[model samples]
Target: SHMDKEGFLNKVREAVDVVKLHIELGHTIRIISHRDADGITSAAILAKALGREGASFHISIVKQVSEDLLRELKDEDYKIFIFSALGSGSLSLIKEYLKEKTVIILDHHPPENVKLEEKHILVNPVQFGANSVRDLSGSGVTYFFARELNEKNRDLAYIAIVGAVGDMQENDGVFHGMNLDIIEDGKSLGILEVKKELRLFGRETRPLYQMLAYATNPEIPEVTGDERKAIEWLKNKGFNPEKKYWELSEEEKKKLHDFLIIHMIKHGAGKEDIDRLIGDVVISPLYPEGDPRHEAREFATLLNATGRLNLGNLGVAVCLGDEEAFRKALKMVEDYKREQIEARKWLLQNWNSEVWEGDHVYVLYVGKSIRDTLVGIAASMAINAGLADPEKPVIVFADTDEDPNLLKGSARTTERALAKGYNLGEALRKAAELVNGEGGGHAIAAGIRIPRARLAEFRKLIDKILGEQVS
Candidate 1:
């Protein structure tokens, strides 16, 4: 039987009690997490909760879990281990190496086929028949655990919403399932506010023209990436182009929303894509207006910038309410934005020569021109900008900087494609395994690492898998 919300809460309470016992026993806990916004927030939530309980713990934010990484962790002296945003795919490895230590996994990823011992607990929503991709996030699970540990941790609810936004858990700009519960928690605390508005990046900080020009989700033809055109469109529609989205009047906002919807529909956007134009925009009332972190989406992007730029510690610190860390992370966001701009520019300049189209998918072999960490962003930009076919998944390959023989691959697909049963995570996992590599993620996005020499075979396998999935 599928676990209900109350049943899941009961399980979280049980897990919290287990952790409390360890804290009472004075066992130091080691926190391991992925280097992403969700992972960073998850670690921060647990770290804060543990600190409040007078528990000693250490945190390590990593790119991914691997056998080598586990081998290193196995030698650590911590008696308790908490894997946030990860460990679902590597349960077998954890069982093999860390059977003696108490383990708790707070992740939203699909789990591997491995049963853990009584000393360990895996708190994943997917195991309870919830949609891991949209119902909750790694931080959401960690948030619930923290809330159960103490009611005071409910203050961290907004941070969980930030992680969910980072994970793209919202569909059509609205959060559902358990994520909605987190939002309500945030609202009740007077820290988070949800409003129906134009769902564009930088709506809180950027001018209207810049916001429209830089919009990627359901990219508007003739307006996106063209500042002058965006300004012209706004002026033609009788709205001030220099004002920020929040600066617009209520009547003006409604007019702009209607115009954009018609514009997107005319540009051949599907209902799913068009619906993304207007939806619930989450705001953090705790932050001052005009601050980038004031909006949840912008805050999530800042957190992602910190993680992708290898400054995940700063991300965690910011989530834990460090002002200095927030300033540092803001600087890192500028650097991250520059890198993304350069990557997008390169893709546009080399699209004809570098992008290879297969019957079932499009492959872009960036080959060190773009950093491995930026390949996923590049793939998303390509799809959003119509540089690649939206109906097919785009697989981007880049040379890994650490090893000349290894390549990193990132895949992204549209919601329409997902509705057709194209599961990028499953396809990438199966394809990467065939090439002796490793990969797995959500149905809409995934990543992989493989030998450089096996690129051709990997591409062929992915094409076949995606073809089978859609067929």
Candidate 2:
């Protein structure tokens, strides 16, 4: 695949050999994974692949795995450590803690300007002499790492596929930098497929849909109804267990897609791309065999929730091989999902065109009616409905205002957007730095935190940056 001199299959072979080296030697390993679905899935694949004694894995948000966390980490005795979906900022922070330990970094972002010796495994797009931040994510790198295992863990390629989607890495053929290779590999091997529209489990996400409905630009339960009704409907749908969320007949899928696309267009998809853009989709199976699939789908949703709510441990533990871990996190996830659906309803009903944009910048602050994850969903909805250009990252703010309480914001973009050099992390950091905030991540998706008063400043900075980058 990618046939770019360095064969992807060869790379996979090399990676397996590396893993075998450590496994054969009986080394204790610790994996420090990010809390998102991609990171969690990557950790899970690694855990299963290298199942052995003295091996342990834990998940953390980027903020949680700081220097302080590393100092605490020094207490543990492991021969090696692996970080996934890790931000560029964490690499430098953890470098010191990596002393005397072999480190393997399966990240897509460009490596920081720091130097790594022979002992460290800094596998990044940059290290390969390719563009870093705009290429791939940690999980994409993990897929290649899987390749190195000589197909010993091919079953885990779904991790690569889903995790990539979790990061929104595959949009309009935008795989960033590392994605092209994976795309080629997938196409060649027939492991991954693409289509115009992908339908997934809309049944299990009744709570989420209810939450999303509250922000429907007019605040209404257009689909599943109030949260309670939504849950009932979801249970009804799952009673069959064999039917998948996206496995609806073409007519039904068309109706649902049309409804969402129209809703996005009528409200926020005013310009960028289309708030409710549809088509060119990737649909993952709800379960290995289309059962109620609370575990798999919930696992995906839980990771998204943790990233949004800062409940990193909840997301992390759910992926661990324990029934209790899943139990502890599922309820919290359901609650948050319902809250988000309600928020979406409010957005749909109560959206104010007046607050859509300001003089300094065209900023959207849905305020109390926003779901943390829905911001991106809303942004995507906006882009799809032609609100913003699909080729540029859009900034969305939600939940708070200034005066000691800073607002949280996120930026989302497509792979095509990234290939055009849309580095949202740099955009956010540069903007946030000017506004006295700290935010960064991989190129396609990034975020920031700023005082509510600095909202205009953040918007102006991002608009200006996109103006320059997109053209």
Candidate 3:
């Protein structure tokens, strides 16, 4: 049987007790996290909570906490190492090196069932056999610990919502289980309000036609990339709003909303994808007018841009209420969006030329023409834009600049594929291992780094594994 509510609560209580002891004893905490949106938000939430109590702490945001990081940490004087968004997979290393010291893990990934020494507490939902897809995010786990630190930290629930959505925890047009609880808390505290509106990427920032042009979730066939076509379509509906999406009249909103459903059907989008046209949109009064942070999803995208562009500290600083950092972040968002649009256009034009189709995947073997950091996101855009088949997983590869011998690979699949028993992460992990590389992540998305010489062999192995999983 799955773990019951009481069993999960028991884990939470145990985690809270361990943290409380340290706070009471006045141990300086050292926070470490990944550089992704989830990780940045996770650190931000904890930083605020720790700041509230005047707790002494230091924070480090890095790409991934590897053996080298742990080796370096052995020389540092950290009274307590609090890892959020990472460390679940590296529990054994922490146990080996940091076991003598106090350590706390607030992660959401599946971790090995390893026994820890004294002064170590693992607060992962997977430990209790909980569903990671539904249960929580790295920031959600951090929020729980923050709440345990102080009841007032509940006001930070909106930040947790941002993290969960940033991690794409909303699978079926809504955030599930624990994420929903946080959403409710945000609403109750008046920090957030959920409104039903068009689920496009930018409602407040972009113009109507540009908004439709940039949207990829239900990529409108002609309107998605063609700004001209988007405007034409809007004009045809007799609903040309002079102002932005938010300033449109209710009558115009109704006409455009209903018309888009027809457009989605005409564009051959699936019912589920079409259903994503509108849903619960979290709004925040905390952000000033015209700022991306005014809307939850947009703020999540802003966080994503910050992290993906190697400016995670800017995101963390913004989260910690740094006004200057927030301005820099918004500037970064515009530049990032421009780069993304350019990449999307390039991929659309080069799809058949650069990408190869397999029985169960669309493999794009991009050379240095595309940056390694961008291959994964580029592939996702291709999949969302219907340039490739969404039913099958899309595999993207790009040569690494730093290491001439290495190749970076990323894989993404639909939730429908996952529901059919496809585990992209497991398949990639096992396949990469077979080809002498390291790889692992969630079932829907994963990445790998392999020897460039073994690229073909790795491709074959992944194809075989995906075939086995889907067949």
Candidate 4:
């Protein structure tokens, strides 16, 4: 149970009561969701529940919701509007569209502390003294709502599991709080399977050699970047390197897993990184046997690639039970992975020119080259490729192509950094606002987009902000 607090539980019941009342009222519903994997899954969960209830509804997915976007829906006669994974901090803008209609927000992020009326229902764990980042994701909140609608909805728990993983809630090598409770639900319902295995992302899809090749976080020294070495090593072990990772026999998998453990340690990988390399691998039964989505992490990557590739609608369609969309998105996912590989190579080759440094932070400013969405992935790769120390923080910047004059900034830190009192989200939020920008995210990872004119000042301020937190 994730309802330890009475106030939180009471709020939950109140939200559920409102949902049931609306459903019973038999009015049209509108759902507006974010474009990330978590948002897509949250929308899917709500969509399923609404569909099962035979409720009339409309759904829209957006990269960012704004006053302009909300205004577009103002004329529509929807009795209830649900916002998933967003609207926590944008209620004022959202309220501009709500005349007498009810609004429901299922999010885990911190909300804008504002007075609310009875028509607005907020179901965020943070509002109940819960660990916002680690407890659950937006989809997990939706899943709870779905379960409240019908206990049989527990089968959908696997989607929330993927959502949690996609949101990086499992950054500690395991899920916790409400996420742990959902993991248990997934297992008990027979929709998910967990086992100790290699922690690669594409366990069900990518070839064994490719999987090892793409292992950048704790790059298997002398092996990760060298396909020849990876192949030769697998050949030496009497395993086929071209086969999919799941095709390997149990004994072979164990041997390879053990081999990597030794290889990682020999390369001076720290305990925390090693802990990430081998752990419980979650398998979802919703996907076919040989499909990449059969593995929870692979499913998460699929959703992430779709969102990052600007095909977030395809991701949402798949989550909404569109099989054809899922099949078509596979190629898009592969294309995104290829781009990621190329970007990682480019960063590795040009680390000195592309990446800059502060005393406690490494800043990578690939101005006007990488896409705003891709820069975050590049920054993550830079940190993983050892271009920056995990003990410090990494902040990457790029020019947003869609909306110009804004430099997108992404900050990434590790659990070790968090242990040292570093909160990148708060730092980025404050630092970005100081330069006339808006920003906020998890403590381990955060992002902001600021005017190009303030780039230099923003950099200085973020470095100072981060330095104070870590010190």
The CA lDDT of each predicted structure is 0.86, 0.55, 0.78, 0.79
135-219: candidate 3 lDDT, tens digit per residue: 6889988887787778899998988887877777764566666777788888888998777778777767777888888877767
Model 4 alpha-carbon miss at residue 299, Å: 1.5
Kindly list the per-residue Cα lDDT of model 1 for residues 1-471, writing each as its tens digit.
Answer: 133788788888878988988999999889998898899989999889999999998999998878888898889888889999887888888987888888899998888877789988988888877877788899999999999998999999988888888888885778878988898898899989898988888777788998888777767877877789999999999888999887887788999999999888787776777887889889888888788778888888889998877789889999888999988888776666667768877888998897878888898999889999989989998988778878889989999875789999899988778888898988988998899899988788888899999988887888899889875
Candidate 1 segments exceeding 4 Å error:
1-3
**Leading candidate by lDDT:** 1
Residue 120, model 2: Cα distance from true site in angstroms: 2.9
Decoy 4 TM-score against native: 0.93
For each of the candidates, the C-alpha root-mean-square deviation to the true structure, in angstroms, is: 1.9, 6.6, 2.3, 2.4
Residue 15 lDDT in model 1?
87
Clashing pairs in 3: none
- List the lowest-lDDT window of 10 residues for candidate 2: 289-298
Candidate 4: residue 85 Cα off by (Å)? 2.0
TM-score of each: 0.95, 0.67, 0.93, 0.93
Per-candidate clash tally: 0, 63, 0, 0
- Writing each residue's lDDT as its tens digit, candidate 2 over 208-230 gives 34433333222222332354544
Query: In model 4, which regions exceed 4 Å deviation?
Result: 1-9, 71-77, 95-100
